[PDB]
Amino acid sequence: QVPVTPDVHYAVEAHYRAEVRLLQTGQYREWLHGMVAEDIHYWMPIYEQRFVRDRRPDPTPDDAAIYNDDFEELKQRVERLYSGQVWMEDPPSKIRYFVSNVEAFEAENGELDVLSNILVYRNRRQTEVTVHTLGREDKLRQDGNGFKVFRRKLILDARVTQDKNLYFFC
């Protein structure tokens, strides 16, 4: 695939930084409506530990996944956070994302295929801290002013999740 120009690469990183800011500040409605396309597939597959010899195909959207959502399903996930009855988020927790290795490639009709590494640090209550690392494989389309994501696949590094939940967006 053809790497994007440095100017488009700039634009994609700036998009991802804005996305991170919205999500770190609980602006989830602004993120969903402004940065996620109505035809989104938001997907976090379950990968099992298989021997190299195992010839089975990798997970598809038809198979087990932690997230496997369209727009309305993401909206429900987002809207639940605006209830004042999410006890675990009162007082609120903290999240901080470190996005690196953004590589963007030209697709058709001005769409882009984009890869990134993500490191997620989560803090809550008094001494709770959890950390996650993932890869992210996005398809983006331009939404002057900006981008919207319409395919997002999230690849977790840990087989057993060391956190009470994975209830955060990437």
Binding site: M44, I46, Y47, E48, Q49, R50, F51, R53, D54, D62, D63, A64, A65, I66, Y67, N68, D69, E73, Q76, R77, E79, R80, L81, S83, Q85, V86, W87, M88, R159, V160, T161, Q162, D163, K164, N165, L166, Y167
Partner: protein, 448 residues
């Protein structure tokens, strides 16, 4: 260790905070529960063909579970009898043999030692492989679900389920080809005692409307009536001799399924056969939403169709595995749809399950303080509003909201903890429910 522990009070329906915290209690549990009871390993569906296998836990022990050539299932300890190295690191696969990669000792599908490198040259054919099998575990199956047990003195799996089979047949056999499990499982660690999530699923209808107020709001439907725990009986609670229990919300099986219609169609299409095979009183259950557990540490929601096993990691931690239950004869899109809906609500990023994590962990870690820990936990809700029922076996509590199933769970916990062996448990089979003193409850209820 007294023979009549005060850790659980079955007269006043309360349990000592020590049960969520104390290491000595936990070690006794490992000995008198986890090393004695039948534990959930999975389902034939997870290893459906000869040579298929999965790795799983039984409490803190790793095992390999393998579909034999003859079509039977066997399990053994996932540790080499040479220097003890874990034999198999794959979650699943197909294998005729399992190789320890330290020195290359080879185990068969039943844990037998079949080959050692340099047996002739270096061992001088003097090693007898017959005595060196990886440790076997008893495996029995019920409607395709596979359980394991370390105690030769345990009753059969079918007798251990006992009168709970009345209920499980309703759903696991059902009106079609029966339920099965779909993996791969989610796995996560949670900083809680194993009993907090188990008691939550076995018996806790009360929390749903409070804890899951926000999620119920987004979902809508029948279950939203529960939100806020407000003065608006819904259903029933059940408990049995070996601690198994559940609560049921009438007519609500598919209530969380937003999209969701293959599963509801499946129920409507098969309920007539449940009435034929199992009666109208079990048809009622077939279309209800259950939260249940199979003692000690398997929990499930029937309807929502999440299925969990809570593996202890010491008194203050667990590792929970989450599968989906689906009808084996449901169409591919219905199976995938059930899986999406169960995972969105009760997976690791569950819209409901995510609310539960602090409830579980907090009720455990508060007891780090000695003053906090010197106290009892209450499970008296609805005591006396339950008893033996003329149709339903076990003990039945009126209403969906109550603590009948907590009472039955902890009554059996105490019985196991006090019993030096299975014989001692069996000795009290007939009187297990004497602590449920309202014997006339249902005679009055059903003719009022």
């Amino acid at each position: 260790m007294s023979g009549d522990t005060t850790l659980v009070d079955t007269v006043n329906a309360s349990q000592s905070r020590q049960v969520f915290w104390d290491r000595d209690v936990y070690d006794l549990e490992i000995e008198r529960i986890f090393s004695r009871a039948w534990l959930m390993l999975g389902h034939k569906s997870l290893l459906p063909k000869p040579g298929d296998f999965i790795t799983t836990y039984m409490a803190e022990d790793k095992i390999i579970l393998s579909h034999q050539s003859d079509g039977t299932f066997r399990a053994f300890i996932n540790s080499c009898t040479h220097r003890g190295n874990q034999i198999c690191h794959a979650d699943s696969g197909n294998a005729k043999a399992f190789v320890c990669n330290y020195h290359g000792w080879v185990y068969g599908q039943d844990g037998s030692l079949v080959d050692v490198p340099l047996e002739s040259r270096c061992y001088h054919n003097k090693l007898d492989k017959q005595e060196l099998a990886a440790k076997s575990v008893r495996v029995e199956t019920y409607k395709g679900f596979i359980f394991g047990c370390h105690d030769p003195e345990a009753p059969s799996l079918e007798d251990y389920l006992g009168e709970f089979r009345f209920y499980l047949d309703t759903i696991w056999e059902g009106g079609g080809a029966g339920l099965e499990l779909l993996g791969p499982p989610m796995k996560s660690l949670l900083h809680c005692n194993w009993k907090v999530p188990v008691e939550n699923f076995v018996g806790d209808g009360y929390h749903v409307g409070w804890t899951h107020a926000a999620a119920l709001g987004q979902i809508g439907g029948p279950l939203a009536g529960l939100a806020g725990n407000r003065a608006d009986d819904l259903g029933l609670q059940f408990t049995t001799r070996h601690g198994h229990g559940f609560g049921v919300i009438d007519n609500a099986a598919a209530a969380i399924h937003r999209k969701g219609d293959g599963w509801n169609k499946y129920l409507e299409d098969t309920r007539g056969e449940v009435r034929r095979k199992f009666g109208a009183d079990r048809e009622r259950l077939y279309v209800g939403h259950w939260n249940g557990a199979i003692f000690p540490n398997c929990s499930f929601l029937y309807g929502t169709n999440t299925f969990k096993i809570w593996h202890p990691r010491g008194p203050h931690e667990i590792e929970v595995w989450t599968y989906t239950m689906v009808p084996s004869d449901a169409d591919p899109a219905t199976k995938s749809a059930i899986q999406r809906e169960a995972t969105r609500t009760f997976g690791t990023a569950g819209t409901l399950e995510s609310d539960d994590g602090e409830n579980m962990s907090s009720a455990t870690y508060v007891n780090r303080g000695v003053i906090t820990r010197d106290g009892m936990m209450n499970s008296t809700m609805g005591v006396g509003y339950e008893g033996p029922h003329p149709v339903y076996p076990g003990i039945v509590g009126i209403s969906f909201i109550g603590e009948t199933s907590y009472r039955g769970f902890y009554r059996f916990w105490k019985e196991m903890i006090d019993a030096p062996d299975w014989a001692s448990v069996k000795a009290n089979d007939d009187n297990w429910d004497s602590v449920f003193t309202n014997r006339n409850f249902w005679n009055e209820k059903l003719n009022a």
